[PDB]
């Protein structure tokens, strides 16, 4: 199981090391449909066109 | 390292009172990743008489 | 936020906008019309353009 | 457990917590037989006297 680092005596316990607070992520998807036309402004919750 | 997360839910249109049934996000489990190091050592020799 | 990295509010908002962005993309790609826009993939099936 | 909440906000598993570099020790038994009797200096291997 665990043995890190039993060489030859100072084995420690809870894995005394260091850690990084950097967060990373790979690719994200290509947002092609998010910008296909302008945001047409409406003052009202319905609108009509003749 | 963050994971993919992920969606939201559209309102039921007529829901205007408390609550409007707004769903919630996908639980982003902020998972650890770790590294390891191995050692190599090479040795060579010669003798004074040679 | 009293035992973590003292900084989860940036991490929360960057994911929540991404979750909104992918949700509007999904609805624009695919939509029945149940509380949501009428996304493109099924939309051409209505006027039968397939 | 450590992984709390899980509806719905971003929370991690372990190795979030701050560690400490100080070492503590229990109150060991006092040292008395090793620091009571007088030293006799010698300069060979065996000492003889009459």
UniProtKB/Swiss-Prot annotation, chain B:
Assembly and binders: Interacts with the decoration protein; each hexon binds a single copy of the decoration protein. Interacts with the portal protein.
Protein name per Swiss-Prot or TrEMBL: Major capsid protein
First and last residues shown, out of full length: 210 to 259 of 458
Subcellular location: Virion
Gene: D20
Reported function: Major capsid protein that self-associates to form 120 hexamers and 11 pentamers, building the T=13 icosahedral capsid which about 860 Angstroms in diameter. Responsible for its self-assembly into a procapsid. The phage does not need to encode a separate scaffolfing protein because its capsid protein contains the delta domain that carries that function. The capsid gains its final stability through the reorganization of the subunits that takes place upon expansion. DNA encapsidation through the portal triggers capsid expansion and the binding of the decoration protein to the capsid exterior.
Segments crossing the lipid bilayer: none
Domain of life: Viruses
């Amino acid at each position: 199981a665990v043995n890190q680092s039993s060489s030859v005596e100072v084995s420690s316990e809870s894995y005394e090391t260091i850690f990084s607070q950097r967060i990373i992520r790979d690719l994200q998807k290509e947002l092609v449909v998010g910008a296909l036309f302008e945001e047409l402004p409406m003052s009202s919750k319905i609108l009509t066109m003749l | 390292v963050e994971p993919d997360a992920g969606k939201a839910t559209w309102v039921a249109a007529s829901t205007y009172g408390t609550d409007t049934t707004t769903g919630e996000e996908v639980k982003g489990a902020l998972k650890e990743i770790h590294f390891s190091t191995y050692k190599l050592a090479a040795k060579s020799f010669i003798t004074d008489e040679t | 936020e009293e035992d973590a990295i003292f900084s989860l509010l940036p991490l929360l908002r960057k994911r929540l906008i991404e979750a909104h962005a992918v949700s509007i993309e999904e609805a624009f790609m695919t939509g029945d019309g149940s509380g949501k826009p009428k996304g493109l993939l099924t939309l051409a099936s209505e006027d039968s353009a397939k």
